[PDB]
Ligand binder design. Structure first.
Ligand SMILES: O=C(Nc1ccccc1S(=O)(=O)Nc1ccc(Cl)cn1)c1ccc(-n2ccccc2=O)cc1
Lengths: 52, 234
């Protein structure tokens, strides 16, 4: 079911390359080693409310 | 914003406010990056010269987190028309970069296909602004937000006296008294996914505000992603 199954376990963008799940992130985020999570690069990444 | 709730500290950091010569807000915007603001093309005809304020939550007094930015270049979609309100989108490049901080951060731009299949299919989105809290009233002094349900595209076309183009989508309530309103135009409509907020719409128009049998109309950001990327480069 890939991307249709809970967003392919992706944090953000989910695509299908060669009938396989491929995750990606928005600008300012780097794909984690597990190829699923999105890690911010600065203290104010996009889409995150500022709570501190 | 009619109904909804006040934006608490840090909850709507991507909200931008276009202010006229009198330093009063007349439209909203969404922060996309340190140099760019997304808003509605029809807002450009609400004031000759305007600036952009970010980090504001209460227009009554200055707390110290607000920042005003002058607009360097205005990029309005050439196809926008007041006769249809289609292609209601514009991008503003600022003269100086926005400094991100508490209450000041960009909303994420999603990819097209993913957004349409994963974000636009969610049950709700969030709209915000310093707009009127009633169809008849003055601009709110406090930034508000409202969870608005995505509306079936056919049900909304049938409920509208104006043609809903493919560059538009509907969100809101049929009878419940909550909706965006005058002044919220150009503002953000974001959809949450795993605690990350992506810009999905631009407050565009509506027949009155929160009227029974009527919905809020927004510009579909996914129909202009290529246009936006281009504009953020030119
Ligand atoms: O200004 C408008 N509405 C209004 C009217 C009386 C009072 C208060 C408001 S409001 O501006 O406060 N409403 C809003 C604005 C955002 C949202 Cl999401 C909900 N309601 C409006 C703008 C454009 C159209 N329209 C659409 C297509 C072709 C021609 C055309 O004219 C219709 C109406």
């Amino acid at each position: 079911k890939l991307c249709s199954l809970d967003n392919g376990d992706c944090d953000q963008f989910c695509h299908e390359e060669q009938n396989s799940v491929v995750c990606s992130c928005a600008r300012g985020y780097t794909l984690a080693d597990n190829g699923k999570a999105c890690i911010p690069t600065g203290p104010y990444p996009c889409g995150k409310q500022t709570l501190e | 914003i009619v109904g909804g709730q006040e934006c608490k500290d840090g909850e709507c950091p991507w909200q931008a406010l276009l202010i006229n010569e009198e330093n009063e807000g007349f439209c909203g915007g969404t922060i996309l990056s340190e140099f760019y603001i997304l808003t509605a093309a029809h807002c450009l005809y609400q004031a000759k010269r305007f600036k952009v304020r970010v980090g504001d939550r209460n227009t009554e007094q200055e707390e110290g987190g607000e920042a005003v930015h002058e607009v360097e270049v205005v990029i309005k979609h050439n196809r926008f028309t007041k006769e249809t309100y289609d292609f209601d989108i514009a991008v503003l490049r600022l003269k100086t970069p926005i400094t991100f901080r508490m209450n000041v951060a960009p909303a994420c731009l999603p990819e097209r296909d993913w957004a349409e299949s994963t974000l636009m299919t969610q049950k709700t989105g969030i709209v915000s602004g310093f707009g009127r809290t009633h169809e008849k009233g003055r601009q709110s002094t406090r930034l508000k937000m409202l969870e608005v349900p995505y509306v079936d595209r056919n049900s909304c076309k049938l409920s509208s006296s104006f043609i809903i183009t493919q560059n538009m989508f509907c969100a809101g309530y049929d009878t419940k008294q909550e909706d965006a309103c005058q002044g919220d135009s150009g503002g953000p409509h974001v959809t949450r996914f795993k605690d990350t907020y992506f810009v999905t719409g631009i407050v565009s128009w509506g027949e009155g505000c929160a009227r029974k049998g009527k919905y809020g109309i927004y510009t579909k950001v996914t129909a202009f992603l290529k246009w936006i990327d281009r504009s953020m480069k030119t």
